[PDB]
Amino acid sequence: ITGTSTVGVGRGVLGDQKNINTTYSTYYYLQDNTRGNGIFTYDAKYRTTLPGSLWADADNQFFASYDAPAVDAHYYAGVTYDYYKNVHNRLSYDGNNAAIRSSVHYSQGYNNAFWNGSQMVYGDGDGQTFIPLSGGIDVVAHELTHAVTDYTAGLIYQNESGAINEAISDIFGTLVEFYANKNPDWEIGEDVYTPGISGDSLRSMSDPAKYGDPDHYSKRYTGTQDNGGVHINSGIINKAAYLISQGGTHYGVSVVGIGRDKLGKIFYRALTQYLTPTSNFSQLRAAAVQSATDLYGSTSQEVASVKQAFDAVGVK
Ligand SMILES: [Ca+2]
Ligand SMILES: [Ca+2]
Ligand SMILES: [Ca+2]
Ligand SMILES: [Ca+2]
Ligand SMILES: [Zn+2]
């Protein structure tokens, strides 16, 4: 809608207070005009019809519990936009400042979030397995990273290429979590998963096997469920990424860490320059080695650590 840019205040899913960019025209709308062609947040009103209604509020204060998921979807979309722009010189997901749209209150008791090819969608959770999914910045950045991948490499969402697609989303969701410095870690979804149980998460990058996901290629899932294991076999790539950043010894192979900033630069280059829709794990390894070579030279420690990390998870 057309109106005056302003700033409102509200409380997110975890009860923290934050300022959000809104637009004023009779009502105050969750429309942020300060970032590219805008960030727009919608109310799906517990239905599955999308996008729903652009979120309208009478007083620019968003402290109702119904408001919480919208506040966080809108705010964390902004943070994720800022990360891609400031760190990777990328303007929104398509690289030309496309509008970012999110709907919250999708369906009833819906325990997931997703990018649907056009926008992000967030369930409220059922209150025991999940709380509203937009409360996790690693979740928001995971989903919007799917948009980035779709516009670049185009990795198909099945088998190894789909597992790479999901790992990339976990890797950048994590890097955005560190960027915002909100109690960052190498776990996925810990802020919105099982509000009854402290210390757990949906997936772990530092130790995927903690939740039964593979941490070595010899342990890959080869069946048909979950589109050939796209959320399962991602653990193999996630572990590799964790090793490249943080270092460690894994199945007897030692990796010297090169830190988060370089991990992001190498993977962003691989993604945007070398990966294609049908890339498999072996091709990811070559793309990552070539990226590190482009950036730091073929005899660098950075290339050495990328090779060691993939040797450690059994990807040749
Ligand atoms: Ca209000
Ligand atoms: Ca965290
Ligand atoms: Ca996390
Ligand atoms: Ca929990
Ligand atoms: Zn995903």
From Swiss-Prot:
Keywords: Calcium, Hydrolase, Metal-binding, Metalloprotease, Protease, Secreted, Signal, Zinc, Zymogen. It catalyses: Preferential cleavage: Xaa-|-Leu > Xaa-|-Phe. The active site is at 143, 231 (proton donor). It is found in: Secreted. Ca(2+) 4 binds at residues 193-194, 197, 200. Thermostable. Ca(2+) 2 binds at residues 138, 177, 185, 187, 190. Ca(2+) 3 binds at residues 177, 183, 185, 190. Zn(2+) binds at residues 142, 146, 166. One of its GO terms (biological process) is proteolysis. Binds 4 Ca(2+) ions per subunit. Binds 1 zinc ion per subunit. Belongs to the peptidase M4 family. Extracellular zinc metalloprotease. This is Thermolysin. The lineage of its organism: Bacteria, Bacillati, Bacillota, Bacilli, Bacillales. The gene is npr.
